Each structure stands twice: as C-alpha cells, then as structure tokens.
C-alpha cells in the first residue's frame, strides 16, 4: 500500500532483437531532499541516479526482470524484457488484448535492415501484406483475432520468416 | 570470435575436381540469418562471387559458372565444402569462404591459393 | 544482372585529406543492401560498410558512406598511411551478387 514506482519501455515492444536499442522510463516522485533513481535487473543493481536507463545494443543477457525506485516512489512491480536470437522477429507490445482495444505488430528486422515485401500471418493464412515493411495494426480486436502469427518478408533476394507468437485475445 | 579457415589441394591437374573445404566458429549454420559464400579472386584482379548455401540448406550459384559449382554444409562439424568440376587455368586463383547474412558478408576466411596446372 | 563501376580506378592521396570513391549501380531500388569492404594487398576483404552508410563496429568513424540512388559514396577522411588498400564496393540486393572493380587508394610522402 505504500506508493510504487512504475516502469515503461520505449519503444513499448517487451520482445525485441539482439542488437536493438530499449530505454527504460521510472515514473517516480522526487522532492529537494533526494531526486535520484535506482535501476534493477534481475534484482542487482545497474544505476544509482538517473531518472532512465538506456540499453544501447541488447545482449541476450540483458533480458530478464527491470524494477526502479525512487526514496517516495517504492520499489516498481516488475516489467520483463525478452531479447531474442534471429533476423527477423514479430513485435509485440504485451502479452493479452482485450476486444475492441487495438492490437499494434511489427515485423521487426536486425539492425532494422530494410524488409519488402512482406506478409503478417494467421493460423497458417496471409492476413496483410506490403510492397514495403509497415506495422500490422487492428483497430478493434474481436475474439477471431486470436491465433498463431508470424511474419514474413524478403531482405534482397532470401525469404525470412518469424518464429510464431501467440496472440490472444481476452476481455 | 567468428573465424573461417579454407583448405584446397593447393594444386592439381586440369579437368580434375577441385574440392574445397571451409571451417568455421563463432556462428552456427543453424541460425536463423546465417549462411557461408565462397567468392575468388585471380591474382591482381577483382572479386568474383561464386555460390553460397544458407540456414534452411537454400543454395545460390553463380550463374556463369555452368554447374560445376557444388555446395553443402555439415551442421555437426561446422563445416561447408565446394566441388568446381572441370577445371581449367582460368579457375586458378585465391578461394575465400566467408560468414554472410541475407544483407552482406561479415567475416571472411584468410583465402587458399588453388593453382590449376599439370 | 547490377553492374556496380567505381571512379576513379586509383588514386593518389595526401596524409590527412579527404577520399572520395564513387561507386554506381545500373539498376536502381528505393536502404539499399550496399557494401563496402578494404582490401590490404596481403589480406581478405574486411567489411567496412555495410547496408549504404552503416558504419562496422570496430571501424574508425573517418570512414563513412552515403546513397543518393544509383550514387553510393564511400568518404575516407582524414587519410591515413595504413589506408593503401584496394576498396571494394558490393550490392546484395539481387541475385547474383556482384561486386565493383574496385579502385586502388595509394598515400602520397
């Protein structure tokens, strides 16, 4: 019951690439006594003042559990990081979708290398499909929207697609 | 941490069989994005892109060099081998293996010297 | 078939100014999969360049590269004594890939 800090993620996507860059925000209270923040990963500490913490180029070591505090803010619940192995990679911001909230997917590429040609799938069918990489985003989810995806796409001349991802949707 | 190191015959006779053979670290060809390319390059002259096979076992070939050009992979020995077939003077230069990705070539081996004369 | 010609085919430079190398495709599409890589005469090609202007880890940033459509631009500055080497510009972005001849930087004392 004591008041808690709260970590974002920008850009907001929990599952990212190797190689990606992620910055961590704490919303927290400060007052003219103590303005810092502290950082944790995994529970142990990786900074002490700054108010964000910057990951430049993530590791799969980097994935895992982040909690910040400040001395007014305690100690946040948790936000999960996963940093993933491949060249091409479905994006996704969380993990359940309730109906009518919009559902935001990225066919996301390493060092974002240039994609064409590319196609967001469900269950197995061709959903939506660009001469050039764009997001895949449905307005208003319905209950059909569930379902395995993954993406697809050509870098030059060889096809990659994504491993698959579970997207559910809930109430 | 990823290197290729190539290995040839460093000489044989002409219309034979050259049999090349890279072997590398640092990577796996099991990785989604990962493929190895051989590229050769006669002495003083430019590079010449030969053929390459990827993650899924997909192989290229250059299509001017008829179908002499054979590549496979060994998944368990980390290795990738090259048959040119009916070789001729012409074929005489350094052959290099390299660690590419569906957008450049990475890393490459120090080369080997195959010189194609009886 | 991209047929990519580099100009000038060498080059004499002076320690310390800037290098420009040219490199120009046939064929144009919309980043491009545009490599460069430095050659040293005893040595394999090292990537410096990679995907039109992305600088390889490891690189001293006065190497640096730009597109401007069919124009890819390699800038090497300032021009160092280790810098003799043949520069090779090369496109991945269609079968089969293909390299430029390449163009032959030699330092001037």
């Known amino acids: 019951d004591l008041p808690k800090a709260v970590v974002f993620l920008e850009p907001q996507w929990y599952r990212v690439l190797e190689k990606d860059s992620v910055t961590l925000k704490c919303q927290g209270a400060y007052s003219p006594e103590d303005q810092s923040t502290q950082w944790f990963h995994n529970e142990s500490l990786i900074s002490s003042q700054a108010s964000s913490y910057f990951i430049d180029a993530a590791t799969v070591d980097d994935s895992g559990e982040y909690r910040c505090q400040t001395q007014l803010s305690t100690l946040s619940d948790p936000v999960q990081l996963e940093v993933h192995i491949g060249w091409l990679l479905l994006q996704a911001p969380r993990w359940v979708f309730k109906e009518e909230d919009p559902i935001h997917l990225r066919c996301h590429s390493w060092k974002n290398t240039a994609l064409h040609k590319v196609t967001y799938l469900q269950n197995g069918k061709g959903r939506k499909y660009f001469h050039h990489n764009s997001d895949f985003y449905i307005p208003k989810a319905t209950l059909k929207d569930s379902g395995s995806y993954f993406c697809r796409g050509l870098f030059g001349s060889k096809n990659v697609s994504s491993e698959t991802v579970q997207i559910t949707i809930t109430q | 941490q990823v290197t290729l190191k190539e290995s040839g015959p460093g000489i044989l006779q002409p219309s034979q069989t050259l049999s090349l053979t890279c072997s590398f670290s640092g990577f796996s060809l099991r990785t989604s994005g990962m493929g190895v390319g051989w590229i050769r390059q006669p002495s003083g002259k430019g590079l010449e892109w030969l053929a390459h096979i990827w993650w899924d076992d997909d192989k290229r070939y250059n299509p001017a060099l008829k179908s002499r050009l054979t590549i496979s992979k060994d998944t368990s020995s980390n290795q990738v081998f090259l048959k040119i077939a009916s070789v001729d003077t012409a074929d005489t230069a350094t052959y290099y293996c390299?660690?590419?990705?569906?957008?450049?070539?990475?890393?490459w081996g120090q080369g080997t010297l195959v010189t194609v004369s009886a | 078939a991209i047929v990519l010609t580099q100009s000038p085919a060498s080059l004499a430079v002076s320690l310390g100014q800037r290098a420009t190398i040219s490199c120009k495709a046939s064929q144009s599409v919309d980043d491009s999969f545009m490599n460069w890589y430095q050659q040293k005469p005893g040595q394999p090609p090292k990537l410096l360049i990679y995907t039109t202007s992305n600088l390889e880890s490891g690189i001293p940033a006065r190497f640096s590269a730009s597109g401007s459509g069919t124009d890819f631009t390699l800038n090497i500055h300032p021009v160092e004594e280790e810098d003799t080497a043949t520069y090779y510009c090369?496109?991945?972005?269609?079968?089969?890939?293909?390299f430029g001849g390449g163009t032959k930087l030699e330092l001037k004392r």
């Open positions: 090369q496109q991945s972005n269609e079968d089969p890939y293909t």
């Open positions: 390299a660690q590419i990705n569906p957008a450049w070539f990475a890393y």
